[PDB]
Amino acid sequence: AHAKNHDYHILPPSIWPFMASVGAFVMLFGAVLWMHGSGPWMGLIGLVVVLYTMFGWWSDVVTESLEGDHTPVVRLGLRWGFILFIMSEVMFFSAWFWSFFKHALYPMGPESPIIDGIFPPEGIITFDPWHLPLINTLILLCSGCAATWAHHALVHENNRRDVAWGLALAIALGALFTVFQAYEYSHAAFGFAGNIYGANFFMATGFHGFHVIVGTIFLLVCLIRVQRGHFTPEKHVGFEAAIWYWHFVDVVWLFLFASIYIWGQ
Amino acid sequence: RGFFTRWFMSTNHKDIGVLYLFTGGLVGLISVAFTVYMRMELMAPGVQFMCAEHLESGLVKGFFQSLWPSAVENCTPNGHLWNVMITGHGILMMFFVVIPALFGGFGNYFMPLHIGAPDMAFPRMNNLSYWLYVAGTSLAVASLFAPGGNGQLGSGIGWVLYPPLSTSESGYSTDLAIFAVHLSGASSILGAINMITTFLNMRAPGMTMHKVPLFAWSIFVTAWLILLALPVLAGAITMLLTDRNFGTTFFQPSGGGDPVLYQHILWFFGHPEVYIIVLPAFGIVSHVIATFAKKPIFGYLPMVYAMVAIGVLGFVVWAHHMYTAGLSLTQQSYFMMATMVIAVPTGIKIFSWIATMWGGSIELKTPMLWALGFLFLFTVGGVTGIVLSQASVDRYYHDTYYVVAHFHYVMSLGAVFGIFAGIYFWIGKMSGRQYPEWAGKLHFWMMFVGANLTFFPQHFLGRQGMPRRYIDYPEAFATWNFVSSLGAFLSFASFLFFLGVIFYTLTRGARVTANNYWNEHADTLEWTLTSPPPEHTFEQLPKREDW
Amino acid sequence: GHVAGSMDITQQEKTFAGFVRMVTWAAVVIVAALIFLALANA
Amino acid sequence: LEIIGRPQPGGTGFQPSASPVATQIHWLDGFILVIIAAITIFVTLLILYAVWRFHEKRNKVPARFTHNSPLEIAWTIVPIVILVAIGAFSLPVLFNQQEIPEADVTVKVTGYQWYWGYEYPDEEISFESYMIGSPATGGDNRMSPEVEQQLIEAGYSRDEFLLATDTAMVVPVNKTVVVQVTGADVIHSWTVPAFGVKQDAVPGRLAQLWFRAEREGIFFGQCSELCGISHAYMPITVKVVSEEAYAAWLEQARGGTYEL
Ligand code: HEA
Ligand code: HEA
Ligand SMILES: CCCCCCCCCCCCCCCCCC(=O)OC[C@H](COP(=O)(O)OCCN)OC(=O)CCCCCCCCCCCCCCCCC
Ligand SMILES: CCCCCCCCCCCCCCCCCC(=O)OC[C@H](COP(=O)(O)OCCN)OC(=O)CCCCCCCCCCCCCCCCC
Ligand SMILES: CCCCCCCCCCCCCCCCCC(=O)OC[C@H](COP(=O)(O)OCCN)OC(=O)CCCCCCCCCCCCCCCCC
Ligand SMILES: CCCCCCCCCCCCCCCCCC(=O)OC[C@H](COP(=O)(O)OCCN)OC(=O)CCCCCCCCCCCCCCCCC
Ligand SMILES: CCCCCCCCCCCCCCCCCC(=O)OC[C@H](COP(=O)(O)OCCN)OC(=O)CCCCCCCCCCCCCCCCC
Ligand SMILES: CCCCCCCCCCCCCCCCCC(=O)OC[C@H](COP(=O)(O)OCCN)OC(=O)CCCCCCCCCCCCCCCCC
Ligand SMILES: [Ca+2]
Ligand SMILES: [Cu+2]
Ligand SMILES: [Cu+2]
Ligand SMILES: [Cu+2]
Ligand SMILES: [Mg+2]
């Protein structure tokens, strides 16, 4: 801006947003198609386009930060936005937990609601909380510590080998969660269709497994940035959001773990 | 400024707001015309228009015949056409007409100006909100033309999509409608986050949160409620989607599901939605009342805190839309009692408005007529709600037309009044061309008259037992349906006037050259700029005394 | 007239500080309410 | 035939009071209506008054006040005491209608797409009720010579088309009937204006309602919850008769004939 007195970030035009909205129209219309006997090709196109848009858009986000556009308030604007994003995330889960706690409390049975049935559902076999469950909660707690440790080092010691070390370690353990989580599905004692327990069980940990993967990918991109030297102790916003996010993922799992595996057995 | 560059890759919050206005305007007419359809068909008993025999004809063929009466004898009652109409209205209106104009048009464009901010915190992401609003619309409309219930097209379910009718309805119509609401909820959450970082981070020096315009405060509270409510609706509608395409059983009794739990998680967002619509309307009213009564808005803090009072109560009263679905008496009292409390907050607002007017000299320009209409009709609408808040009286009133009149008074004679109040009030500022004081007055009078005829009769019908979502009705309900129907054609006429008034204006409208074309009492930062505003408003930040 | 970074951000930092406190206040007030309800009526 | 509880051309009021809950609903609304007739009027009168008393040619110069503590207080307590008042007279009516008595009769209502299912568990009686124009009776849900005639033979008239059913639920005056409503497929809702009672029929749930008729006659209700295409076409008909005929009804209904 020719003669400005302010640090906020004003931006050149940008096509990205339109593109990703067509992608998503096509994605979801094709996704409807594919759930109704027709072919996948239209849905994967959508996602291919959306993913293209997402990578540009975020590439340019760093780009712009390297152009020094990320002034003191600009970096605070970003941090705040992102924090509303995790508050939105938290409310999304509130819907998933709300179902699990209601059916777990007032289970449907023939005189419902005068009289409630039984939970867990007749003939459902809940998993053992201390054999695999605890394994995956120790795997996340662990990674959490490992990822925070890369955060601290960078900001507090400015140590950059350490920083990438904690990242790698955290990244690989986030993928392990997924592998172990997949194992659980393999060995499930109930089904997904036909029974509340399966719907709630699976959609609930199902949405949490989504996020882990988004988590683990996010950190991967920090490792990459960190390898090309993209972070300083004063400027390090992707880093702050990843660590905050990772931690949300873990806080959601922990409550799942105590809600669904520990309390509801 | 290639035309493609400007509107298709927008980064400026004042062009993105213009986009949401026309866009919302568009879909409002489309939606609006489906209402004429219904009113033609409800004008008179028996089914004359929505006949089953028109299905044989291609769509291009049967369509045109449907705008012309058939004899009862040769008319074959196709209830599904009705059910699809009633739900295109509902879904278009509550997701694609009013929140987009009032929140993303007049809020995106102006909230920023009012705080003395360059632009919006996240420009790219805002443009992305605009375009995902299109996707949803598109998907929702596409839905009318795709395979749907009973071998016809279109999902005739309810704008709230309750199962197990929503799950069992055949086709994929209701899948497109399900994902339309998803995109519209992303739309709203992206917009919501943007307006929340911007207002608390991008205010001008010395502008404390108690020194911010009320219009901006209303977009602030609105934006909070969206953030906390749409994600809960992404979940209840993801449970419809799974139960239809992955044979889950959330609201399917054969697998231990509960249709009622759907109603709780939908209304926990279905209540916050109605305050999300009228919040912005309360903010534009302030402005218009301060401005045209030539006097400071009375009780500014209590107006700001009333706002936050409503939105917070708005998340704890949602089973009032379920009094007859099967709830405990305890549940019925908690929710009746709790809903009653929002009356304090709103009244304070209503009195302060009458008070501002009190003691000042009033200029009955077009923009003030709407504000005064709204003062009256929103109260009419409001009262009703208290009657409906009473669990006991709701038995009879539930699912009858006495609710339909509620919601249209405080929606069609309420927040819609705020959509036009803001239109007339800020058309020059955003266009460089003012409108005709005479045509504006005519419009106002037309639609107040029409729209009172449209829904006042329905209070009767509701007391006389007419059920909701019928395509036909008894002989005893003809009288008042005629009246209503007459009323809606009178109101549809008006909306046509208004689009010509607007068209004219942006064509041959008075060139505006002043920076404030109203009066000295219009004291917010938008009136300190040209007339049509610079493309980069506030490179130089608003000096503290400037306003 | 470039001077990236030299703007005054005192007001925003104090604002964020309140924001972070107010949200925590909220969150925990709901949870203990949710809990209350649970105990009284569940 | 005494057709009481039914719509009345050009009617703006309620349906006749055939029971104690309806009596009270009518009284609860009345009272509530005046208190908000008062407020509505009252709110217009200031708007009007102020618009004219303070129009710019009547008072050229504006005032600058923005707060009047006393007044604010008044306007926030007044409505809060108004609301308590309504509470006093409203919770009580709620409790009477949702606190269910000892039955003297018991029916079970089950909404099925495009008809109702009635059962009297104590007397071993089960039948169904369909509108007279249902495709279940020859028509397409619209008036036709056949339709007209079929209703005349029922005991109804051309104008009660969409409300009369082929099978009526019979009932004894002065007796408490508890209706347990459940839905069989999608949701439905079973009411009777004249009784002041109404309740949704939801798949997987047993909801109860009670009612007592002080007088005899034909009372009509109508599906109340978007259930499909023939949402408009699933009337409800209730017949309240004396107790001596009710018993007779029991016996006559055991041979498979389900009409009175
Ligand atoms: C806020 C949105 C909204 C609006 C504006 C309207 C406007 C109108 N609606 Fe309604 N309507 C609903 C939301 C709305 N409606 C909903 C949610 C339902 C229930 C759905 C369901 O049952 O599932 C419903 C139901 C409904 C019904 C009965 C349904 C039934 O049988 O169950 C009827 C009955 O005739 C009706 C009539 C009308 C009429 C005549 C108008 C108007 O045409 C009359 C006056 C208003 C205008 C004349 C024009 C207003 C135009 C705008 C405000 C445009 C905004 C854009 C710009 C300014 C650029 N509507
Ligand atoms: C802008 C939209 C809007 C707004 C603001 C409101 C506001 C209110 N609504 Fe609602 N409502 C709808 C839109 C809205 N509503 C819609 C669309 C539906 C139907 C949904 C569907 O089922 O499809 C609905 C449905 C609905 C129902 C359920 C209907 C049913 O049973 O099917 C109820 C019942 O509790 C209710 C209550 C209220 C109340 C108490 C208010 C209050 O907010 C009003 C408060 C205002 C006042 C109280 C007047 C101002 C106060 C004073 C002037 C003080 C003086 C007066 C007194 C103290 C009494 N509304
Ligand atoms: C199976 C194998 C298939 C593999 C295909 C993989 C395709 C690749 C897709 C991966 C996406 C890459 C993500 C990168 C985003 C991070 C951008 C970033 O860090 O820059 C943003 C800015 C950083 O600035 P700063 O850190 O201060 O720079 C310091 C330099 N001095 O910090 C910011 O501005 C903060 C911005 C935060 C980013 C938002 C993230 C939240 C999104 C979560 C939504 C989930 C969507 C997932 C997709 C599902 C499909 C719908
Ligand atoms: C019951 C609640 C449970 C809900 C789950 C939410 C869990 C939150 C996730 C935790 C992640 C925090 C990770 C901290 C490690 C490294 C990052 C960090 O320490 O940032 C500290 C930051 C201080 O920020 P500051 O120093 O002010 O920066 C510029 C100041 N001018 O302080 C911050 O701003 C940290 C921001 C991250 C917040 C994530 C999202 C918050 C969502 C609201 C959660 C509220 C939880 C309620 C807490 C109750 C406490 C008893
Ligand atoms: C992110 C990591 C951590 C995890 C994040 C998510 C935490 C969420 C934990 C709680 C979320 C909501 C859980 C609510 C449980 C309610 C259980 C329930 O359904 O109660 C029953 C009642 C319906 O029962 P009914 O069938 O009508 O009665 C039959 C009885 N014979 O149902 C009702 O009447 C409704 C009951 C109350 C409604 C509460 C809904 C509020 C949801 C928002 C919660 C916000 C959590 C705040 C997060 C703080 C983080 C900073
Ligand atoms: C009802 C609930 C439904 C849930 C859906 C809600 C949203 C889903 C959409 C996915 C993408 C949203 C991620 C939001 C990130 C928010 C964090 C934040 O504050 O990011 C700030 C950054 C600002 O971007 P910018 O305007 O370019 O600022 C430049 C400053 N350097 O912002 C960014 O980094 C922008 C990156 C966006 C990438 C484009 C992707 C579009 C995809 C839309 C599909 C949505 C479908 C969601 C379905 C939910 C599934 C259950
Ligand atoms: C019991 C059930 C309840 C139901 C749920 C409740 C939902 C509520 C949604 C309503 C949102 C509106 C909140 C408005 C807050 C207004 C407070 C305010 O502005 O106080 C002024 C204070 C003073 O700052 P001052 O310096 O004087 O002025 C600015 C000069 N810079 O300013 C400050 O210190 C700045 C504070 C910023 C405002 C904070 C906004 C966050 C509040 C939202 C809570 C979110 C709850 C999250 C729960 C889900 C968590 C997962
Ligand atoms: C890593 C280590 C982690 C370990 C974690 C350990 C801690 C575990 C945390 C557990 C928290 C779970 C809370 C679950 C809540 C259960 C309460 C509940 O469901 O009660 C419902 C209540 C009674 O339901 P009802 O059907 O009457 O049952 C009666 C049977 N005689 O329903 C009623 O009485 C009806 C009254 C309804 C009143 C609604 C009140 C509103 C509720 C809160 C507001 C929600 C709004 C949120 C806003 C957020 C936005 C800011
Ligand atoms: Ca007709
Ligand atoms: Cu509500
Ligand atoms: Cu039905
Ligand atoms: Cu129905
Ligand atoms: Mg209903």
PDB file of C-alpha atoms in Angstrom, chain B residues 4-114:
ATOM      1  CA  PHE B   4     -12.836 -12.203 -13.791  1.00  0.00           C
ATOM      2  CA  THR B   5     -10.114 -10.746 -11.558  1.00  0.00           C
ATOM      3  CA  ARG B   6     -12.477  -8.616  -9.523  1.00  0.00           C
ATOM      4  CA  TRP B   7     -15.357 -10.955  -8.661  1.00  0.00           C
ATOM      5  CA  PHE B   8     -13.796 -14.348  -9.227  1.00  0.00           C
ATOM      6  CA  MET B   9     -10.607 -13.927  -7.106  1.00  0.00           C
ATOM      7  CA  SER B  10     -11.792 -11.297  -4.635  1.00  0.00           C
ATOM      8  CA  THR B  11      -9.642 -10.342  -1.632  1.00  0.00           C
ATOM      9  CA  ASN B  12     -11.562  -7.171  -0.707  1.00  0.00           C
ATOM     10  CA  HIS B  13     -14.228  -7.451   1.997  1.00  0.00           C
ATOM     11  CA  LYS B  14     -16.481  -4.727   0.428  1.00  0.00           C
ATOM     12  CA  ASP B  15     -16.865  -6.620  -2.844  1.00  0.00           C
ATOM     13  CA  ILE B  16     -17.339  -9.930  -1.119  1.00  0.00           C
ATOM     14  CA  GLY B  17     -20.180  -8.370   0.875  1.00  0.00           C
ATOM     15  CA  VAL B  18     -21.741  -7.014  -2.364  1.00  0.00           C
ATOM     16  CA  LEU B  19     -21.431 -10.596  -3.756  1.00  0.00           C
ATOM     17  CA  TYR B  20     -23.316 -12.108  -0.774  1.00  0.00           C
ATOM     18  CA  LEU B  21     -26.126  -9.482  -1.150  1.00  0.00           C
ATOM     19  CA  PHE B  22     -27.083 -10.050  -4.722  1.00  0.00           C
ATOM     20  CA  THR B  23     -26.450 -13.710  -4.254  1.00  0.00           C
ATOM     21  CA  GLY B  24     -28.755 -13.934  -1.252  1.00  0.00           C
ATOM     22  CA  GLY B  25     -31.094 -11.647  -3.206  1.00  0.00           C
ATOM     23  CA  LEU B  26     -31.122 -14.042  -6.083  1.00  0.00           C
ATOM     24  CA  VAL B  27     -31.963 -17.157  -4.060  1.00  0.00           C
ATOM     25  CA  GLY B  28     -34.459 -15.109  -2.060  1.00  0.00           C
ATOM     26  CA  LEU B  29     -36.517 -14.473  -5.210  1.00  0.00           C
ATOM     27  CA  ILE B  30     -36.150 -18.054  -6.352  1.00  0.00           C
ATOM     28  CA  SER B  31     -37.149 -19.173  -2.917  1.00  0.00           C
ATOM     29  CA  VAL B  32     -39.710 -16.377  -2.724  1.00  0.00           C
ATOM     30  CA  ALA B  33     -41.372 -17.637  -5.946  1.00  0.00           C
ATOM     31  CA  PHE B  34     -41.887 -21.159  -4.497  1.00  0.00           C
ATOM     32  CA  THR B  35     -44.065 -19.426  -1.907  1.00  0.00           C
ATOM     33  CA  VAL B  36     -46.307 -18.040  -4.625  1.00  0.00           C
ATOM     34  CA  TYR B  37     -46.635 -21.545  -5.902  1.00  0.00           C
ATOM     35  CA  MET B  38     -47.785 -22.764  -2.513  1.00  0.00           C
ATOM     36  CA  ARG B  39     -50.173 -19.881  -2.034  1.00  0.00           C
ATOM     37  CA  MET B  40     -51.696 -20.386  -5.407  1.00  0.00           C
ATOM     38  CA  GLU B  41     -52.285 -23.994  -4.401  1.00  0.00           C
ATOM     39  CA  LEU B  42     -53.566 -23.100  -0.934  1.00  0.00           C
ATOM     40  CA  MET B  43     -55.757 -20.244  -2.087  1.00  0.00           C
ATOM     41  CA  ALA B  44     -58.540 -22.675  -2.575  1.00  0.00           C
ATOM     42  CA  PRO B  45     -59.590 -26.114  -1.253  1.00  0.00           C
ATOM     43  CA  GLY B  46     -58.991 -29.411  -3.084  1.00  0.00           C
ATOM     44  CA  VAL B  47     -55.891 -29.911  -5.211  1.00  0.00           C
ATOM     45  CA  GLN B  48     -56.050 -27.918  -8.385  1.00  0.00           C
ATOM     46  CA  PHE B  49     -52.426 -27.353  -9.207  1.00  0.00           C
ATOM     47  CA  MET B  50     -50.217 -30.086  -7.846  1.00  0.00           C
ATOM     48  CA  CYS B  51     -51.564 -32.942  -9.919  1.00  0.00           C
ATOM     49  CA  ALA B  52     -49.935 -36.339 -10.483  1.00  0.00           C
ATOM     50  CA  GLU B  53     -50.816 -36.349 -14.199  1.00  0.00           C
ATOM     51  CA  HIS B  54     -48.180 -33.667 -15.015  1.00  0.00           C
ATOM     52  CA  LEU B  55     -45.366 -36.160 -14.396  1.00  0.00           C
ATOM     53  CA  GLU B  56     -45.925 -37.922 -17.711  1.00  0.00           C
ATOM     54  CA  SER B  57     -45.104 -34.727 -19.537  1.00  0.00           C
ATOM     55  CA  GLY B  58     -41.396 -33.944 -19.710  1.00  0.00           C
ATOM     56  CA  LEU B  59     -40.477 -31.357 -17.069  1.00  0.00           C
ATOM     57  CA  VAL B  60     -40.328 -28.545 -19.621  1.00  0.00           C
ATOM     58  CA  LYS B  61     -43.928 -29.478 -20.517  1.00  0.00           C
ATOM     59  CA  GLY B  62     -45.792 -30.196 -17.237  1.00  0.00           C
ATOM     60  CA  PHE B  63     -44.117 -27.194 -15.581  1.00  0.00           C
ATOM     61  CA  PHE B  64     -45.977 -24.504 -17.536  1.00  0.00           C
ATOM     62  CA  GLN B  65     -49.292 -26.334 -17.018  1.00  0.00           C
ATOM     63  CA  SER B  66     -48.752 -26.218 -13.276  1.00  0.00           C
ATOM     64  CA  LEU B  67     -49.140 -22.410 -13.262  1.00  0.00           C
ATOM     65  CA  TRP B  68     -52.731 -23.021 -14.425  1.00  0.00           C
ATOM     66  CA  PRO B  69     -55.656 -24.475 -12.554  1.00  0.00           C
ATOM     67  CA  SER B  70     -57.174 -27.879 -13.164  1.00  0.00           C
ATOM     68  CA  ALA B  71     -60.547 -29.174 -12.007  1.00  0.00           C
ATOM     69  CA  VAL B  72     -60.573 -31.206  -8.779  1.00  0.00           C
ATOM     70  CA  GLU B  73     -62.122 -34.031 -10.798  1.00  0.00           C
ATOM     71  CA  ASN B  74     -59.192 -34.153 -13.191  1.00  0.00           C
ATOM     72  CA  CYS B  75     -56.625 -33.236 -10.553  1.00  0.00           C
ATOM     73  CA  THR B  76     -54.720 -36.150  -8.954  1.00  0.00           C
ATOM     74  CA  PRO B  77     -53.319 -35.072  -5.568  1.00  0.00           C
ATOM     75  CA  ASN B  78     -49.523 -35.426  -5.684  1.00  0.00           C
ATOM     76  CA  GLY B  79     -48.636 -34.664  -2.059  1.00  0.00           C
ATOM     77  CA  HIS B  80     -44.914 -34.998  -2.774  1.00  0.00           C
ATOM     78  CA  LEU B  81     -44.820 -31.832  -4.940  1.00  0.00           C
ATOM     79  CA  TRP B  82     -46.116 -29.851  -2.006  1.00  0.00           C
ATOM     80  CA  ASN B  83     -43.667 -31.490   0.444  1.00  0.00           C
ATOM     81  CA  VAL B  84     -40.753 -30.688  -1.931  1.00  0.00           C
ATOM     82  CA  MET B  85     -41.824 -27.071  -2.302  1.00  0.00           C
ATOM     83  CA  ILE B  86     -42.293 -26.453   1.431  1.00  0.00           C
ATOM     84  CA  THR B  87     -38.770 -27.786   2.047  1.00  0.00           C
ATOM     85  CA  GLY B  88     -37.013 -25.825  -0.816  1.00  0.00           C
ATOM     86  CA  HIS B  89     -38.414 -22.730   0.883  1.00  0.00           C
ATOM     87  CA  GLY B  90     -37.212 -23.700   4.343  1.00  0.00           C
ATOM     88  CA  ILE B  91     -33.775 -24.866   3.256  1.00  0.00           C
ATOM     89  CA  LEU B  92     -33.187 -21.973   0.848  1.00  0.00           C
ATOM     90  CA  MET B  93     -34.413 -19.402   3.320  1.00  0.00           C
ATOM     91  CA  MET B  94     -32.689 -20.630   6.508  1.00  0.00           C
ATOM     92  CA  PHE B  95     -29.409 -21.476   4.904  1.00  0.00           C
ATOM     93  CA  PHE B  96     -29.094 -19.457   1.645  1.00  0.00           C
ATOM     94  CA  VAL B  97     -31.074 -16.193   1.676  1.00  0.00           C
ATOM     95  CA  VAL B  98     -31.127 -14.322   5.010  1.00  0.00           C
ATOM     96  CA  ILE B  99     -27.913 -15.242   6.882  1.00  0.00           C
ATOM     97  CA  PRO B 100     -25.731 -14.569   3.862  1.00  0.00           C
ATOM     98  CA  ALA B 101     -27.177 -11.065   3.271  1.00  0.00           C
ATOM     99  CA  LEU B 102     -27.382  -9.952   6.867  1.00  0.00           C
ATOM    100  CA  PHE B 103     -24.234 -11.634   8.070  1.00  0.00           C
ATOM    101  CA  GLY B 104     -21.919 -11.923   5.037  1.00  0.00           C
ATOM    102  CA  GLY B 105     -23.218  -8.996   2.946  1.00  0.00           C
ATOM    103  CA  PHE B 106     -23.829  -6.146   5.407  1.00  0.00           C
ATOM    104  CA  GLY B 107     -21.432  -7.651   7.951  1.00  0.00           C
ATOM    105  CA  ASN B 108     -18.387  -8.358   5.764  1.00  0.00           C
ATOM    106  CA  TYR B 109     -18.583  -4.964   4.023  1.00  0.00           C
ATOM    107  CA  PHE B 110     -19.333  -2.786   6.983  1.00  0.00           C
ATOM    108  CA  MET B 111     -18.195  -4.407  10.321  1.00  0.00           C
ATOM    109  CA  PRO B 112     -14.580  -3.650   9.217  1.00  0.00           C
ATOM    110  CA  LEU B 113     -15.281  -0.087   8.213  1.00  0.00           C
ATOM    111  CA  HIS B 114     -17.050   0.473  11.578  1.00  0.00           C
TER     112      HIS B 114
END
